[PDB]
Design a protein around this nucleic acid. Structure first.
Ligand SMILES: [Mg+2]
Ligand SMILES: [Mg+2]
Ligand SMILES: [Mg+2]
Length: 48
RNA sequence: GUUCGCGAAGUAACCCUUCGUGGACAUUUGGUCAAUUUGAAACAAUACAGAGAUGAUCAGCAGUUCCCCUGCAUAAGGAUGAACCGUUUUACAAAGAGAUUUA
């Protein structure tokens, strides 16, 4: 319990940020391979 | 349209009427702006969650910003208002030791 406790220094807010940011990156990757597979159909859809 | 005056005609007896003409009086509004889709309100609803300092549950003041919102406000609130929490290499040298090349 303690040996696990010491190792995280931040507090709820920072961790919350780590998540939010990664979720943004999943959004990016997804939207990309959206556009990639649409290029494999040749139809070119512009990014927002 | 008024008035002054002239001329003409008629009525007349110096006038009443009609015609013509001269003169004066009176003298430049408004527009940054066309009448609903295509020159710009903002909320709400759906889904996703669902409140900083900590191991945890709360009071809070601040600080910076090419973010502001409510408020008459130089008051005070808006999660202590929100954003901050991340990515990170060179004024660069001196001494010593081994390998390589050359005068
Ligand atoms: Mg305040
Ligand atoms: Mg609080
Ligand atoms: Mg504040």
């Amino acid at each position: 319990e303690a040996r696990a406790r010491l190792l995280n220094t931040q507090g709820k807010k920072a961790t919350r940020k780590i998540r939010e940011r990664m979720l943004e990156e999943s959004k990016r990757i997804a939207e990309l391979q959206k556009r990639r597979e649409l290029k494999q159909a040749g139809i070119n859809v512009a990014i927002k």
